[PDB]
Design a protein around this ligand. Structure first.
Ligand SMILES: Cc1ncc(C[n+]2c(/C(O)=C(\F)P(=O)(O)O)sc(CCOP(=O)(O)OP(=O)(O)O)c2C)c(N)n1
Ligand SMILES: Cc1ncc(C[n+]2c(/C(O)=C(\F)P(=O)(O)O)sc(CCOP(=O)(O)OP(=O)(O)O)c2C)c(N)n1
Ligand SMILES: Cc1ncc(C[n+]2c(/C(O)=C(\F)P(=O)(O)O)sc(CCOP(=O)(O)OP(=O)(O)O)c2C)c(N)n1
Ligand SMILES: [Mg+2]
Ligand SMILES: [Mg+2]
Ligand SMILES: [Mg+2]
Ligand SMILES: [Mg+2]
Ligand SMILES: [Mg+2]
Ligand SMILES: [Mg+2]
Ligand SMILES: [Mg+2]
Ligand SMILES: [Mg+2]
Lengths: 553, 548, 548
């Protein structure tokens, strides 16, 4: 019995400090570590964590605690935890929480607050944090009653992890966590046993599949979750309907495990996925929400639209599902699969599109600074199926995204709707903490790098096996391209150079700087063999970038 | 897709697609184009006398049909006058869509008069609140309001319509009405079926969604197959009654001596159907010693005292049907369970107070309750306002044999009865509707008597007249032994009702009660009856309530 | 500092310190302790029949006394029923303090029924909205509400009072009533005095604060010394009238042929007093070719069409007195200025329509306006609701010789007239108050007739009866040439009023209008007169309005 008052594993207790109950609750959630920075208003929670199995990981900027937490969330499926103090401690999380929420990464931030009695006073540091976090979280609440302490924390994890996952924020007044409380821990409740979409609705879609000549699956976030993996593969092998994924579902299906994969859609306007979508007469969306890929960019409207997710569709001018299958995805796809009478025979246009994609991929640039394509090829060599890849935001993101089919990484964190900079390095540290035995490669620009570079100290301190690569152009290039194209002049996109090798070494990490085109691969190969934090500076010639951005939406 | 001349045209066409039969409200310049467009549609315009009542009437339509009732008002005070109505609908789970006018998009930046931030005002009391700032999204936003209102656990939705958007041209199409989820997994149902078999004191706790029309047959199938006892929240008051099910333990929420609470505390297995903790605080009934099963259209809203061991989200009707098909045997009632229900029978026999015609003038509450039971049969809808009478009716709710009873009122809003009845009557005009309120609540919505007369609505409104706010006075009496701001003057309610062109009645004798009510029932149209009441016995009734 | 037994005691003591004479509202359990505590105070309890009207009555008290009127309601619907009232008070600059009950502090976290986020709901329509979460801050928060409401440009304030805070004990003291700023700098005043001397077409634009009682004498001193022409917003409608000042150019805001607008466009110097752009959109009058001077208690709320060349913030009364002392000479009117005012005189002579007794039945609007002017003298307060009659009265506002006129209504809220009058009467009971509304607006607040009868309030309410929402119908007629949702049924308003125990009247003849009104005036207590009106001539009047 979960709600029992006589459970030995989860006893009702007269807690000395609210903080103790909080930490006990976190343990029940299966939290392995917490990221953040302490302060007086929250120090008791940090203190209570000393008496628990949960590991404390001090970061150097709170924003990065949110980033690290998201990486943990995306991989484990259990919410990563950020822990900060009140005022600037909380407000420094807001971008991170927005980044986590938009990508569907489960994150729970516990933020300190002034005492309840000091909230009404015009005192400093009494931010309405709940109001500030609400627009960028699924869940935002302040614990005003000590009795609700365990309840609110449990609800935060539930909001973050269940449904379409997202970030959750909890404000903890100082007097509440320091003062005594009566209550018990709430055991963690898994995903609710939800039903498949209605049978009459499933057979209705099955009929459309048979009568369709260019069907295609559009995969969204929820399609990439583990509990849907087996059901998804079963449906694809039974139907052989082609597939294309959003970047939030980039890892849901690979070309190696499915022949009729049409790549990822979201950035480029000339992907096999897009052509098939425009060509489509029937599009079945799985685990997809319009935010992942604007329907205005791919939905011609000429195709019948089917919606399959754990939530109902949020209808809009370019997204009005003709059929709506709401319920457990795995159960829906399983039922749907049992009603596939025959495998799809591809249309000549459909088959040609997939043929063009493979052939193009099956394809010597000693120019200095390094050509982007040279750097991408070098990255592919060192990043294998035992290596996790994290990608920051910038022009390099587009280059890597363009050749994402040829990367053979275990997992790739690249999806970034908010287009937040500085995410790569913290993502890698978070990813490494989940799988320390494996290596993680992070890549950013010089701009994004310096926004989160302070966590290099955290990496050295953790002995994190992370290799960070920097595409150095000494400017904000992805912005400059747009300015050049629109105004034929630049504004505020140029800055000075740095000795990134010596910079990395001042942290106690291994530094590298590619001073020649021929030294690219040897340097990366060497930096990989380092058992610990390493940074590589890679000068890049972005002169060809305007050609690449023309392939975008 | 069509090139619409006015946004208002697209709005009305969308409403038509939603199956809207009528709209309630009051026009203004900022929204008059929508009113104008309704002239060219099958949709009926029903002018009210106060916007708050448009929301109330809309809720009544929503609760019955399951399709959102529609309120239509102008900007500024037109919108702000809806807020109490919208909050009442939302808390009761009544689907309502309010379309509210707004100043032109260009005048929102100027900060001119009548430019309320209505969306901010409506957000705390609605599922959905939005302003249409892009004409292209006009049809999308309206459809989304109906979906938000009608789907999941239903609620109220608000849409702000700038004048220039509804007046100006727009390109777009109507969105066909669409939600329908499948029953729970077989592996989940067999898991619950196993718990029922191994359980010795099972009990169903019925919440809002268990009372929906689409779940009635499936619910009856499960009760007849399992014979597990039942207790309901007041939001599910009409899901099961004492007369149609033998092991009914009454409704829980108000009284401290209900069979349902005793059975819940006794339970070793509690299956909640369509229930959310907000309907009845788990701190009052959940001992935690029982296995807790959750069946609803949404995942459970977990609380410190509500952590379900099993969680079934999906179609309720399909889930309950399947569950019934896997019940191996009917429940054999435990001695303690049977004793509790036996005690309830004796309790029901004691509350009836066999014989003892109460001769008191002013009329004794129980006398009025008995008189109401006589006139309200299975072909009559009953709507109940808020006050002391609410407690009396709620207590003898087991003995009412009404078609439908609208009484659930978490916000405890007064003045809801009459507008509810007008809304309820409009759904089934051929039938009679009885509304009952106090003198306080009556005058807060009495302006709709003219609307009832205009509609020839077959509504009989009863007034418990004490010339005061009694339900407050009693609480003051027990706490302070003195009254403050609970007394006001008398009125000639007969002439008052007749000034509207409705039939007026006044009970001037205890023996004249039933003849008057019967006479008022035989009126084919609006009729009002004033009933003087002696609330001196109320402290005896309030003692049966939860200290709270 | 004292150890209070109940927070409610401290609240009432604070109210006493604020000089509150009465409170309007309706009690409930969550707030009944404050009602109870008012029994032990000099403060009078005035139960209303709908909370919205408590806010309206409170505003009337505020506008007159300058001290905030007080509304007192319970939680949930008690609070949400105030929102329209509070928005109306705030937009008109009426000081109002609403004390609203709330659930216990412990039940706010549980998310239980009746736990509205009232502060979020009231914020968009108040100067000040706060919930008392710390009992120590109880007296501080109440005082701050009054200060927010009364100081600066006045407005409405809301305070949420959790049940346990007002019921539980508290330690604290009362805060004495405190704001008073000094006149503008001498160097600033001499600067303006210089501009007036060098100007050839100066004009005063009077806004809200110019109409406050404390500024009356100082304003009159400045006008008699300068003889600069004057035009007022409707919020300053009663600051100066045509009868008491020769160079009055009427009120600007509604009509497209006012002397004020012409003089403003002609102006080479515009001195705004107590004015904010919200009162009258600068896009309608500010050509920009004139030097602009700003005199108010706050810095100017600058806008694209309102960037004052000179800015005087401070005590208005002291500023205007000093300014007058530095006017070297009276204005010699320009030929264009004199022509405009001459045109206004001919206009006033044309609107009067010399002779021509209008014999029409139903009664012609101008006939009713003439009849109202006869009965409303300088000892009578006039309150005006919203509708077509509002336009008629507003147009002939120059010919009204009333003590005070409450007509300004930016939100254009209906049903304000009667509650305003009850509130106004309570400040000066020995005097008569006349309220006028339409049949639509009447029934939205008609429930307070019982309250008027209970108070023996000497109020005469007039109803322009057309059995419809006429002001909307006209706009529909011009735009669509057809009507929608603007028609409803008739009523016997005489018997309706009499059912309250008030005096009822019905004008059944054009010749019987004045005798009836005179008879109703002679009634010492509540009286209602129904006046059938022929609005067929209205399109002629609406043509005099700004296209808008
Ligand atoms: C926190 C922040 N600030 C600015 C930006 C702008 N930005 C990018 C972006 O998202 C856009 F420009 P858009 O509005 O078009 O979506 S990408 C980017 C990276 C440039 O610096 P870098 O890291 O050195 O990368 P490269 O020089 O190799 O291109 C910036 C600054 C943002 N995303 N986030
Ligand atoms: C809009 C509004 N205002 C006030 C009330 C307070 N009230 C009742 C109520 O809900 C409580 F007292 P609480 O939440 O604290 O339990 S019930 C009621 C009705 C009294 O007037 P009446 O209609 O004549 O009923 P009786 O005299 O026959 O008892 C009031 C005013 C509220 N609920 N809503
Ligand atoms: C709470 C409420 N509801 C509706 C209205 C609309 N209305 C008027 C109004 O303000 C406009 F039309 P707008 O802002 O667009 O100019 S005036 C009015 C009164 C009509 O009914 P009545 O009282 O009988 O007056 P007459 O028939 O004599 O003209 C209405 C309903 C509103 N202001 N407030
Ligand atoms: Mg949010
Ligand atoms: Mg760069
Ligand atoms: Mg229903
Ligand atoms: Mg909301
Ligand atoms: Mg009563
Ligand atoms: Mg004043
Ligand atoms: Mg505000
Ligand atoms: Mg009218």
């Amino acid at each position: 019995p979960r709600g029992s008052h006589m459970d030995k594993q989860y006893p009702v207790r007269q807690w000395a400090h609210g903080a103790d109950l909080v930490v006990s609750q976190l343990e029940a959630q299966g939290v392995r570590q917490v990221f953040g920075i302490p302060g007086a208003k929250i120090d008791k929670v940090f203190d209570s964590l000393l008496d628990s199995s949960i590991r404390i990981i001090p970061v150097r900027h709170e924003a990065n605690a949110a980033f690290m937490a998201a990486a943990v969330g995306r991989i484990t499926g259990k919410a990563g935890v950020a822990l900060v103090t009140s005022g600037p401690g909380c407000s420094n999380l807001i971008t991170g929480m927005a980044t986590a929420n938009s990508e569907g990464d489960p994150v729970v931030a516990l933020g300190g607050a002034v005492k309840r009695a000091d909230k009404a006073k015009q005192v400093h540091q009494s931010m309405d944090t709940v109001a500030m976090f609400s627009p960028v979280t699924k869940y935002a609440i302040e614990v005003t009653a000590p009795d609700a302490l365990a309840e609110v924390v449990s609800n935060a994890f539930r909001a973050a992890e269940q449904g379409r996952p997202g970030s959750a924020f909890v404000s903890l007044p100082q007097d509440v966590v320091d003062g005594p409380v009566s209550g018990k821990v709430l055991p963690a409740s898994g995903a609710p046993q939800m039903g498949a979409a209605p049978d009459d609705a499933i057979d209705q879609v099955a009929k459309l599949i048979a009568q369709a000549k260019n069907p295609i699956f559009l995969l969204g976030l929820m399609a990439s979750q583990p509990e849907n993996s087996k059901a998804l593969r079963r449906l694809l092998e039974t139907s052989h309907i082609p597939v294309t994924s959003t970047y939030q579902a980039a890892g849901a299906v690979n070309q190696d495990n499915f022949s009729r994969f049409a790549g990822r859609v979201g950035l480029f306007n000339n992907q096999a996925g897009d052509r098939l979508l425009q060509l489509a007469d029937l599009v079945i969306c799985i685990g997809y929400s319009p935010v992942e890929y604007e329907p205005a960019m791919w939905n011609s409207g000429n195709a019948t639209l089917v919606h399959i997710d754990v939530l109902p569709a949020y209808e809009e001018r370019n997204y009005t599902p003709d059929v709506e299958l709401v319920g457990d995805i795995a159960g829906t796809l399983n039922k749907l699969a049992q009603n596939i009478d025959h495998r799809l025979v591809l249309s000549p246009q459909a088959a040609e599109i997939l043929r063009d994609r493979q052939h193009q991929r099956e394809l010597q640039l000693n120019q200095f600074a390094l050509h982007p394509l040279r750097i991408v090829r070098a990255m592919q060599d060192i990043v294998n199926s035992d290596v996790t890849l994290t990608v920051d935001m910038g022009s390099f993101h587009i280059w890597i995204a363009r050749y994402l089919y040829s990367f053979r990484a275990r997992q790739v964190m690249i999806s970034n709707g908010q287009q937040t900079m500085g995410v790569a390095l913290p993502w890698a540290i978070g990813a490494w903490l989940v799988n320390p035995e494996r290596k993680v490669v992070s890549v950013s620009g010089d701009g994004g790098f310096l926004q989160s570079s302070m966590e290099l100290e955290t990496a050295v301190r953790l002995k994190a096996n992370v290799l960070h690569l920097i595409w150095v152009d000494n400017g904000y290039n992805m912005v400059a391209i747009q300015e050049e194209k629109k105004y034929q002049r630049l504004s505020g996109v140029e800055f000075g150079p740095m000795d990134f090798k010596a910079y990395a070494e001042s942290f106690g990490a291994k530094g590298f700087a590619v001073e020649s085109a021929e030294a690219l691969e040897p340097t990366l190969r060497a930096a990989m063999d380092v058992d610990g934090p390493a940074v590589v500076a890679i000068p890049v010639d972005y002169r060809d970038n305007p050609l690449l951005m023309g392939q975008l939406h």
